[PDB]
Amino acid sequence: LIEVQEGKAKILIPPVFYNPRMALNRDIVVVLLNILNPKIVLDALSATGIRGIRFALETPAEEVWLNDISEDAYELMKRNVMLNFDGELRESKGRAILKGEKTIVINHDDANRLMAERHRYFHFIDLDPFGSPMEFLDTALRSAKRRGILGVTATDGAPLCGAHPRACLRKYLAVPLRGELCHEVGTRILVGVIARYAAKYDLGIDVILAYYKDHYFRAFVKLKDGARKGDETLEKLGYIYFDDKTGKFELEQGFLPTRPNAYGPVWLGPLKDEKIVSKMVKEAESLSLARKKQALKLLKMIDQELDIPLFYDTHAIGRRLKIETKKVEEIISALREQGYEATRTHFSPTGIKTSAPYEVFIETIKR
């Protein structure tokens, strides 16, 4: 058992999974929570308990629940919590509670069972499982308040990026698109499935922030209460058509596609709430984080990134069309000079988000 520190938290790690590379992911949520201020929060699959402990130590959260089905994880969670908080951690039948400035509840159980027990209870639930969050999504949608916030992470990008299409159909009920656009399509597929599962509870969603980073997909959504809100949310779903010989894409808004070779359904709405993300960059700067440098770099990229469906990958398009292309920086400058919005995107190093029509983009990249 070794001792490590992440952010303001000090924890013991061996078993029980801990990935320091995920400290950035936790920094992001910590930043977000300092803006949204949810009172009652849940770290659904805690492992070492690092996420919930940081929520308690670094955000306005008042009641923090930590849960894990593993006995080893549960034992370690209790130890780590007491390593960061004083008081009496009262335990009884797989549940230990500390009632200090902040109330900490450590639970030993299947996340689905815990969330089923806490119906419409949490202001924020963070689902961060090993791989797919789909076996826990429906219950989380019932456990969060009707105007709650849901944080979802998908680690296995094989199905979301199109490598494992059959698995994507089974888990996400959507047809994935492989290639240069997969990081974004996978991200929109994730948002889209959350929106679809939420509708039956007469709930809609507003995307707070959704992004891709080092082979993992992240989506933060705000639940909207109302059948009509559910209807308007489903109206933001759509499909993508992609020409393999040109890199040109087409969008079709609608619950169902009307032409062959459609990809989706995917969320065609915003992937970020401009205001909040702008605030996040500022909040991140004024906060001591575990990976501050990386956090600011990602948040600034997303903050300045044009929020529009898809993008054009200069490299991939060059290979598809069999043409030579100019550099990304040069292309963006050229597009802006022609009066179009154009920015880089965190989804790909050679991708350019732009309001410009495909043909205008091609004429501009032609070297």
- The enclosing domain of 345 has a CATH number of 3.30.56.70
User: What resolution does the deposited structure have, in angstroms?
Assistant: 1.9
Query: Cβ-count burial of 308 within 10 angstroms (0-12 exposed, 13-18 middle, 19+ buried)?
Result: middle
The partner residues of 108 in beta bridges, in order of sequence, read 68
CA atoms within 13 A on the CB side of 279: 14
166 is in an annotated binding site: no
- The enclosing domain of 240 has a CATH number of 3.40.50.150
Assess whether 291 and 324 both reside in one domain.
no
Structure token pair of residue 343:
């920015």
- Boundary (domain end) residue, out of 285, 308, 331: 308
Do 31 and 224 form a contact (C-beta atoms < 8 A)? no
Assess whether 362 and 270 both reside in one domain.
no
3-class DSSP assignment, residue 159:
helix
Residues 6+ apart with CB under 8 A from 146: 120, 201, 203, 223, 225
Assess whether 223 and 186 both reside in one domain.
yes
The partner residues of 125 in beta bridges, in order of sequence, read 42, 150
Assess whether 285 and 335 both reside in one domain.
no
Assess whether 168 and 294 both reside in one domain.
yes
3-class DSSP assignment, residue 229:
helix
What is the C-alpha separation between 38 and 275, in angstroms, rounded? 17
Assess whether 224 and 247 both reside in one domain.
yes
Phi-psi region of 145 (alpha: psi -120 to 50; beta: other; left: phi over 0): beta
Query: Taking Cα atoms as reference points, which of 86, 48, 41, 85 lies closest to residue 65?
Result: 41
3-class DSSP assignment, residue 109:
coil
Structure token pair of residue 151:
């944080």
Q: Which domain holds residue 29?
A: 1-308
Q: Residue 272, Cβ neighbours under 10 Å: how many?
A: 19
Assess whether 317 and 302 both reside in one domain.
no
What is the C-alpha separation between 160 and 164, in angstroms, rounded? 8
Sign of the four-CA dihedral 29, 144, 277, 154: positive
Residue whose tokens read 């410009």: 356
Query: Cβ-count burial of 93 within 10 angstroms (0-12 exposed, 13-18 middle, 19+ buried)?
Result: exposed
Assess whether 40 and 115 both reside in one domain.
yes
128 is in an annotated binding site: no
Single-letter code of the amino acid located at 169? L
Residue whose tokens read 């993008």: 311
Single-letter code of the amino acid located at 257? P
Intra-chain end-to-end CA distance of the chain, in Å: 57
What is the C-alpha separation between 128 and 319, in angstroms, rounded? 37
Assess whether 149 and 171 both reside in one domain.
yes
Method used experimentally: X-ray
Q: Are strands 263-267 and 312-313 parallel, antiparallel or unpaired?
A: unpaired
Assess whether 222 and 367 both reside in one domain.
no
Structure token pair of residue 48:
């070492």
Phi-psi region of 214 (alpha: psi -120 to 50; beta: other; left: phi over 0): left
Phi, psi of 187 (to 5 degrees): -65, -40
User: Which strands form 40-43's sheet, in the order they lie side by side?
Assistant: 90-91, 95-99, 103-108, 63-68, 40-43, 122-127, 144-154, 216-225, 203-213
Residues 6+ apart with CB under 8 A from 360: 335, 338, 340
Angle between helices 358-365 and 328-337 (to 10 degrees): 120
- Boundary (domain end) residue, out of 308, 336, 351: 308
What single string gives the DSSP state of each residue in 55-71? Answer: HHHHSS-SEEEEEES-H
Single-letter code of the amino acid located at 115? M
What is the C-alpha separation between 306 and 321, in angstroms, rounded? 25
Counting every residue written for the chain, the total comes to: 367
| Integer CA distances (angstroms), 364 to 178, 322, 347, 360, in order | 25, 15, 21, 6
Assess whether 361 and 263 both reside in one domain.
no
Query: Taking Cα atoms as reference points, which of 116, 108, 99 lies closest to residue 45?
Result: 108
- Boundary (domain end) residue, out of 308, 323, 347: 308
Q: How many domains does the chain have?
A: 2
What is the C-alpha separation between 286 and 142, in angstroms, rounded? 35
26 is in an annotated binding site: yes
Angle between helices 23-36 and 50-58 (to 10 degrees): 40
Long-range pairs for 109-113: beta carbons < 8 A, 24 or more residues apart: 109/67, 109/69, 110/69, 111/44, 111/45, 111/67, 111/69, 111/136, 111/139, 112/136, 112/139
Structure token pair of residue 130:
């090993």
Residues 59/60/64/68 CA torsion (nearest 10 deg): -20
Assess whether 251 and 348 both reside in one domain.
no
Residue whose tokens read 């889209």: 192
Phi, psi of 299 (to 5 degrees): -65, -35
| Integer CA distances (angstroms), 230 to 207, 215, 274, in order | 13, 30, 22
43 is in an annotated binding site: no
Residues 6+ apart with CB under 8 A from 127: 44, 45, 111, 133, 136, 137, 140, 150, 151, 152, 153
Q: Residue 203, Cβ neighbours under 10 Å: how many?
A: 23
3-class DSSP assignment, residue 49:
coil
68 is in an annotated binding site: yes
